[model samples]
Target: SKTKIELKDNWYHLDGEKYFIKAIGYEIGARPGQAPYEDERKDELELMKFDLENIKEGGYNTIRTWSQYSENQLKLVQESGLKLIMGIDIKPEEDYGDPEFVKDSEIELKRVLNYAKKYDCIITYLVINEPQTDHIHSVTGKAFVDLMNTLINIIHKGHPGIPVTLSANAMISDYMDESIFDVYAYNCYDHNEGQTATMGFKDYIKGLNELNGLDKPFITTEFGYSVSPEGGNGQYGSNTLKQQSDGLISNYRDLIDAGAVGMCPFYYADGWWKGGEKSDHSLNQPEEWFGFWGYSDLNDKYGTPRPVWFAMRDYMKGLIISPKNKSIHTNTKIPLELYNDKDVKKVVVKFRDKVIYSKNITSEGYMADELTIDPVGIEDMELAFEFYDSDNKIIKNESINILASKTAFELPELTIEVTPEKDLNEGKIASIKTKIETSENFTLLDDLKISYNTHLGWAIGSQASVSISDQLDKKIITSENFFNIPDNCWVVNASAGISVRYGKFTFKIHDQKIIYRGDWAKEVGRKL
Candidate 1:
């Protein structure tokens, strides 16, 4: 047995040593009825039995299940010898202003934590599932914080070592970061980002750098495009089978390279997400193929797997080559750092416009090599580097994105003493304001920037701007720069009060050296 370990730090260590950890898998369904409530066939027990048997034969070590699963369900998972990342699903009933339901949600959460502690096989629990910004409208940030506090308290009640977290989408996760939670988890899906948004895989992982300062473990808890036609729709990015495979494998590998731990692609088998349809042979439900196993809507085919499943399974076996590298988003002036333990001499980094970064390898060998790159466009993109021998022969190559389109900007925090353009000591507080300057590309304040990149040198941008005024008494310095604004660049000339204040930020600007391609199909599709 390969001793169980974490998919964190971009590699796994067995018996406490560093080794690349590859997980090719699918998440079992966990919506209301999909999860086990009363120990019936409706439970994940059957699914676990099936997955364990299949994974053992398939040469896989782990399976990701929802956090809300029952006691018996996870026990069955443990008995199967599969490492468990219990994805906790906290779906609160609507009576938001009602404290009772929130209390019940908290109570139910405790039950799950207690249930999860019984199984030694469970390593992690995703405390909350995809709670959007809407959650704030229902409960106060304090309420959510309280819920997490209670949850953390309860999970550690008996088993103080158990790890629990909310598998939040980027937005909610960011919010939770500002609020409170145990660990970080990203549930990613691109919307408004163009066709290549899904194609430019490197950008996807680099975009996750938002969680950088949290100083905690982060997991790509959920990242797989769906085919539900209705559910599989890509809003900010493309949605397709190739998109799912490319997005999942490419991004997770990049995160793995950039020092991320684990990732669970959405579903393991068809009907695994929304629930499998009963085979009646009368209706045509022919569009559910996100799972590795394809379901026969007409025939009784439950265990049949799909091409995606094969692709993921093979890919997880360390079949595909994921060049090892670490990068900071080029949008920021932060330098790029490369660590190579492999035997190599020099490294060649390829950028847009046929540019290259040729650096000499150190004599000490396998040292961390750090270099800097300038800002690129805001679409999907990457930086490819190749290791070279003294003979200038390319030995191996690797690449990752600078920044993909994410909500680039948000309300800026302002500490306004509101002195006259220059007032040292102002006794009376007049007015204050908070603003975000970006393009008018997207309407939602949170969904500012989108992603687009098919090739390396071109891209698209989501830009916008804003300015608001407030009384000094408000003391509302809680403004936010959600977008990681680039620092120390000609992009913002601070010396010149011509300085960028609020809105009026740049869009579609190119850095020439960094690669970012535009989406051709999306532009044409705009016509129809």
Candidate 2:
């Protein structure tokens, strides 16, 4: 139809800037004989259904899929209104002695591009999925780069719009060369022994950023924590969903801040493998842990928004979005008159129970409500928060550190905005606040009757929730905690629950001021 297509960075560079389009989509696998050819088709349709629901339920609009599916399946994907990040080389190709394997591979790739041309929304083509270090020699990045060059030429011979990628392992990301594809998709995982790496995500992206020639979008195609107790090959990181979610958040948060293109976690649901009774098993045994959802003979369980799901969902709500090459800590006052993505109609910025500034507004755009914040307040000090949306209800919640200060009086300027991923339902805010407390106190349970309203919703911890013991010192308190506050001000549990255990707490709102013993009483919610 046109000149053979060359992968371009346009999928990411829409307006001279890159933005991360991410979601909690998972990887998919096929059972032995049950339509291996149609496995991606079957799984993707199911995944699309789930993604649509997640987008509607949680406001996430992306679903990640692989490259090696049948052309018919690729066509199905395009028609379904979901984007594709084709995971090429789904099967391990280690020792193909025949040198014509490259030519043979081209023949197969042509078939995929035949139908891949039919869709306009096709964004990325991940060259391969998870090529391990041991298999590096035979299936080198050089080989794949050559293959991508050939495949892109062939695909562009007819349809030349979509971009291709050279998906590399975390280790090889730094070493990847050649400029065939449009974007860089790094399939990575942090496999630290016991000391988990905090900047694993940053390190991965930074390594890929080293590739100077192909200046395109950067992505994390297959990064996740395992429930296998350790990362793959008995390596660096833990496999718990908690760690997975943490890593995923770290991945997306930084990428969004850096303005990368797209990111997709490995498989979404636990797959049914071929090895029947004697399969190597671990936590979630073969199938349970790898996916957000587990399947057994078509029956699904343990799939209702795992810790990873909630973490991603909440994070998407407050993800720090920036323009391409713009850092969140980069200095600049956001001009209010020029832009607006207004989802939240109101915003109230608070610091240590003191309302720094509150304003009735209509958007999730930048800080429209200008505060008299000490411009230098962001300097080594952390920005404590209590965010509220319109309808005067607290919706999303978080605590973040101010960008580390470089100069003594230099204030780090951020143009971040608080947006809703879902519809503005006023009633949900109350329960959400309660859920936030429950999630924060999940590790410190003391059998307290912690309920949202009249009904028992969730539980809280004992050491702090029940009674602030002597052991619960400054470490237990958040950095935002003002030392002049009393024990009651430290309470995080529901007020109704507190009243049941103790007595009705009354605020002495009188015309005449009453005497207080110390400054601690004044530092309650009433005083800053």
Candidate 3:
């Protein structure tokens, strides 16, 4: 790899510069009945090359893949100016815990590691994908951790300085050891709570950071929303293409702010092999649609770039447009550049699910769109929007969150107090106490609305809204609101947003965490 990589100071350094791993899962269906690296095609080399080029264009510098790669394939990745984070495709079965089984697995892992060490493009290796910590044949909680350490030791000894970790899901992430693995890699998704969260995704990533007791650098190996509305429709089901773009954009920025070294969206291309026949694009298969590219009406076998492909290019390149403070104090005209080659026909701006603005660009690629926005509320507002290209009629959507500005420049002094019920559980409530102080400089002339979210680990426990009647000329007033404590997780992250009708302004503050228990983060050897 042209990029020299290292994990230190709770971040990844490429060539001594802080590098955020912008990556995507490489599970594209190259051929019918074939998994990712198993694709067999007459023009395999050509297809793969084009895909790599497109991947670079999509704003990702790394690729997360499964299985081993031939030298030629790795060279292809290397030449494309990309890096790989591969997983050892070791599957657990009935004899998974057999002593000979582990030995043979060790041999197999060594074979893979040795080959990977030969390539500069390979940066990190995963021992396995989401291995359970509990009893399975013979490997139990402690045994699972030991198994991981053994594999990690082999990797460290064979490939010195390279990082090694497991592709742990959120559940299994807690069972990891900082001393054993060089880096912490996880696959996380929190889209259901994201729609209304504003800071929802960041809170979850922060929770992961808290879990890393050693404060070792961490990255999300897999985190993208599938664009399969025709398929799954459950709570965490497939998202519309627009929603997929929203998810990726939101996660990319939120994960960064939450202190994650990097993130890899779920996939690079549509994989028809999942959920049914290999050649079929199964209607009910949500997994197939997570890619930035699609094998659709464009007639290109490798796949065509989707709307998200264009949007990510802007975000990843830091071409995002924002007002001062990212807060819309006044009406603003945000300049936008259409770096994507395609000419756009129309652009639509939607704020908080309402179509606030639209324009008929008519092949005008450059954008100077004006937004007429007011304080929607104290909560962070997202300008989630879409643009239609003139050439292919393709629609592209992007989301940018801006903090609602406080209309009253003269804001009152604020303080928050968090009180958890003595016996904390789902049945109990946590009180959010706010003390508002005012003077001749700042006054509480109108009702104040306070909104907040209760977070339990990575998931949002509940969102509470409270309204307070103002104390006309009083200098100080206090308001108390109670919300149910989140269950299944130990800490409560309550972040509050305030809306003032008196001052005709809105703002957010008081990001506090209440430890429901101290031991929840220390349980490392959990079984099942």
Give the TM-score of each candidate. 0.55, 0.59, 0.63
* Shift in Å, residue 113, candidate 3: 2.3
Q: Which stretches in model 1 have alpha-carbon errors above 4 Å?
A: 1-47, 56-60, 93-99, 102-109, 112-115, 171-173, 191-214, 228-243, 272-288, 298-301, 319-528
lDDT of 1 at 10: 35
How many clashes does the backbone of model 1 have? 31
Ranking by lDDT: 3, 1, 2
- Tell me which residue pairs clash in candidate 3: 1-120
The 10-residue segment of model 2 with minimum total lDDT is 505-514
Cα error of candidate 2 at position 11, Å = 7.5
lDDT tens readout by residue for model 3, 384-422: 767666663535666655545435344456566766532
Query: For each candidate, C-alpha RMSD in Å?
Result: 14.2, 19.1, 9.5
Candidate 1 residue 137 Cα shift, in angstroms, is 2.1
> Which portions of model 3 show Cα errors greater than 4 Å?
1-4, 28-33, 36-44, 92-96, 132-139, 171-179, 194-199, 233-235, 297-300, 319-528
lDDT of 2 by residue, 1-528 (tens): 321233245235423333345544444444212333344445456644554555435545456565465655555556655555665563446433335876676677777777667765456666555544324333443454455566567755745665666566543333344245566666655552111121223423553454333366566666565555443344333366666678766656555433344666655655445223223333334233455544444434224555776666655553333222122233323211111123445444455567764566554433322324343422322333334544656655544333322333321111111111122121222221111121121122122112111111111112112332332332231111111212222112111111101011111100101112223222111221
lDDT score, candidate 3, position 337: 31
